[PDB]
């Protein structure tokens, strides 16, 4: 299943969830065709529009967070989506 056919620009099924304690809110796309959860990180590589408007995860501010660090990088169709794995408590919804 190629990421070209994926909405993500006008996905119809999204909502808010939370990561960390206190929960940090993020609006994500509920996607029945994939099986991973990922959010922007405060440690964004570039200060672009993506890092500007999006909400980013900050583990420094989370009593439940557990380090992992396994770095990842899949070539999400068009480009490459990279970051690292991390453990924490997810809340649905957030607020």
């Amino acid at each position: 299943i190629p990421e070209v056919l994926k909405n993500y620009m006008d996905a119809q099924y999204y909502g808010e969830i939370g990561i960390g304690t206190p929960p940090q809110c993020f609006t994500v796309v509920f996607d029945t065709g994939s099986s991973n959860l990922w959010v922007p990180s405060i440690h964004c590589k570039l200060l672009d529009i993506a890092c500007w408007i999006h909400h980013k995860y900050n583990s420094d501010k989370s009593s439940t967070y557990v380090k992992n660090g396994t770095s990842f990088d899949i070539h999400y169709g068009s480009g490459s989506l990279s970051g690292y794995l991390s453990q924490d408590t997810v809340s649905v919804p957030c607020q």
Binding site: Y14, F30, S34, W38, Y76, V92
Partner: protein, 241 residues
């Protein structure tokens, strides 16, 4: 305040796609398919949520409240189905391959007199894709019957005015037949004060062994209350109320 899935591993993206690919509105993706297609074997949220026994029944549902000015993004319910979301009853289909939420399509029939997936086929329910995707040689014919116009680069345009007259397409699932009207399968765009009407079908070949697959996007799901059930491994549809 709702539920709290403890010990969930997830991804912090230090480099992600542009605003041209993922809109300013969405921060990330929360996949809900089986672990088999999970990047780096990372146990999905709902699974963990299942193991931790956080909900009465391992199922969830999407209601595209797309009626007046409700909450955009539809309404997801984790734990069970809710009468209010549908009319009548739900009909289920057993999941064929526990990777995507894949099931068996019986046949697609176009009002005109065309029939695709004639001897049945495979189809995955995908709330993340919009377009209805199908085998190109197969969908090329559909694009034809509905009178779509292939442009160079790929878009099969449809005159905005002619939309209302396009043939309804009906997918046959579990022996039952779900309808799609042009208004429903014809994606429209609007730019600088002008609208562009184009086909909602996608001719794209999914390389096996996962493919050949027909991907049932929101052009279909927005129409029917959809329930994904992990306890029993089935997917049910009911007329969205």
């Amino acid at each position: 305040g709702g539920v709290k899935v403890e010990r969930q591993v997830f991804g912090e993206a230090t480099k992600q796609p542009g605003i041209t690919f993922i809109a300013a509105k969405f921060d990330g993706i929360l996949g809900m398919a089986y672990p088999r297609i999970s990047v780096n074997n990372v146990l999905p949220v709902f699974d963990n949520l299942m193991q931790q026994k956080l909900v009465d029944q391992n199922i969830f549902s999407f209601y595209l409240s797309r009626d007046p000015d409700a909450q955009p993004g539809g309404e997801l319910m984790l734990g069970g189905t809710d009468s209010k979301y549908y009319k009548g009853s739900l009909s289920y289909l057993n999941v064929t391959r526990k990777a995507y939420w894949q099931v068996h399509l019986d046949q697609v029939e176009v009002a005109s007199g065309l029939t695709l997936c004639k001897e049945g086929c495979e189809a995955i329910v995908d709330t993340g894709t919009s377009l209805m995707v199908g085998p190109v040689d197969e969908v090329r014919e559909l694009q034809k019957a509905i009178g779509a116009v292939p442009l160079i680069q790929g878009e099969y345009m449809i005159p905005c005015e002619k939309v209302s007259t396009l043939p309804a397409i009906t997918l046959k699932l579990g022996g039952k037949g779900y309808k799609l009207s042009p208004e429903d399968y014809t994606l429209k765009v609007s730019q600088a004060g002008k609208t562009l009407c184009l086909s909602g079908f996608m001719g794209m070949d999914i390389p096996p062994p996962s493919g050949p697959l027909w991907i049932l996007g929101d052009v279909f799901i927005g129409r029917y209350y959809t329930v994904f059930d992990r306890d029993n491994n089935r997917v049910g549809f009911a007329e969205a109320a």
